Symmetry: C2
Subunit: 246 residues, 2 copies
């Protein structure tokens, strides 16, 4: 599974995303903001599933949607992890467990909170109710980990996709992007599909490897940049940010 420093790099990428919008975000934002947002996004995930026991059911859950909704929550989860280290524990979460206030489907501390496969409603409902509970006690680190475990249940390269997405945003941050100077070499192809083709160029193994993940991330980033028309000079700040230690 995911080594601590991959997690730290992921949070560092999120820091950069937040900083572009608000360089002082760590001073303005609070741990309750992230907890709220994970709650609201978790609610929207659960809502893709036919949870209403009183509604007749036409079609099954759209798992493509569940995958991106997991990704949407990861941003807020990473943000809360960083916020939580700006000084906003384990004897608590076990006592919350023995009080019985994490749920389970009907008839590492994390793995009794996560229920698979996510393709089945009761298991997704319990899992994401538990993410909401986790948020509520500021355990952003367990949420982040649970989301990755969840992506893995859905054969979804979350880390890869997150990196691709990180780098599309660096392109969209520049004025050249809105001005139409930087264009897709392959016109018409949607964004989600160019990104997926960019994430395809490396393995899941490659983006999690404790030794050399940074190589694989840079290969994803280089792909996105190539596909979306970012010239060489404008890529350096994103590459340097990528390569920072944590």
């Amino acid at each position: 599974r995911v080594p601590a420093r991959v997690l730290n790099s992921l949070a560092h990428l999120q820091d950069g995303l937040n900083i572009f919008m608000d360089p002082d975000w760590r001073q303005i934002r609070h741990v309750d903001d992230w907890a709220l947002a994970i709650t609201m996004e978790s609610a929207e995930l659960i809502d893709s599933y036919p949870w209403k026991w009183w509604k007749n059911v036409k079609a099954q859950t759209d798992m493509h949607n569940v995958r991106i909704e997991i990704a949407d929550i990861l941003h807020f989860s990473l943000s809360g992890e960083i916020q939580k280290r700006t000084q906003d524990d384990d004897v608590a979460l076990k006592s919350l467990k023995e009080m019985g206030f994490f749920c389970r489907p009907p008839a590492d501390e994390l793995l009794e909170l996560m229920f698979f496969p996510l393709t089945e409603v009761a298991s997704a409902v319990a899992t994401f109710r538990n993410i909401i509970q986790l948020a509520s006690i500021y355990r952003f680190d367990l949420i982040t980990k649970g989301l990755l475990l969840a992506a893995q249940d859905l054969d979804f390269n979350l880390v890869g996709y997150y990196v691709a997405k990180y780098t599309l945003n660096q392109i969209r941050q520049l004025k050249g992007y809105k001005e139409g100077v930087y264009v897709k070499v392959r016109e018409g192809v949607e964004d989600n599909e160019l990104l997926h083709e960019c994430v395809q160029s490396v393995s899941v193994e490659d983006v999690l490897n404790e030794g050399t993940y940074l190589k694989a991330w840079e290969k994803i980033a280089c792909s996105v940049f190539d596909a979306f028309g970012m010239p060489e000079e404008e890529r350096r700040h994103a590459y340097d940010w990528l390569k920072s230690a944590a």
Copy 2:
């Protein structure tokens, strides 16, 4: 505020609503179902408010919507209270409070969880995050009470509206309603407006009075029935249900 037996009668009305759909609901449904539904409806309430700190804000929250969304949650809250007494405590909730896992807005055990006025975003967000937390520990009784306190902050006669709504559903349960035999004496007027005019015929005080609330409820029910074309014979089962002891 609201006496215990008004609360019990309200839950008894909900029992009847649930029974029409599923007479065996107390055996099939579980405490986690109600907790989930209160969570999902609370999330939709919060979503009427401009909580996204990163979105620019056009228009203020539509409080008419907040009022009905409080009512929507009350159904699930009452249902969970009943379910919780079908055998699915206070030394826990205080320890949850001292662990710090109910929230508050930035810079009776219930009243430090509820924040007013609900017209202001931070106060509504904290309040309804706390309802979600309450749900999560099966404190359906405190949720019910909090919802009433919340209706009171919004000058909303929740009990009145709930009763009106209870009785419109008794009419809609009959085949005559779908067959078009029972019609509004005042054609065209929307449902929500005929109900409000029905709730207007009694005071808030009247529907909470420990001594004589049942009189006032029956006056609301009689109004709704009159307005919606229910003939006398078909009203007896709803009146008898209304009048049951708890």
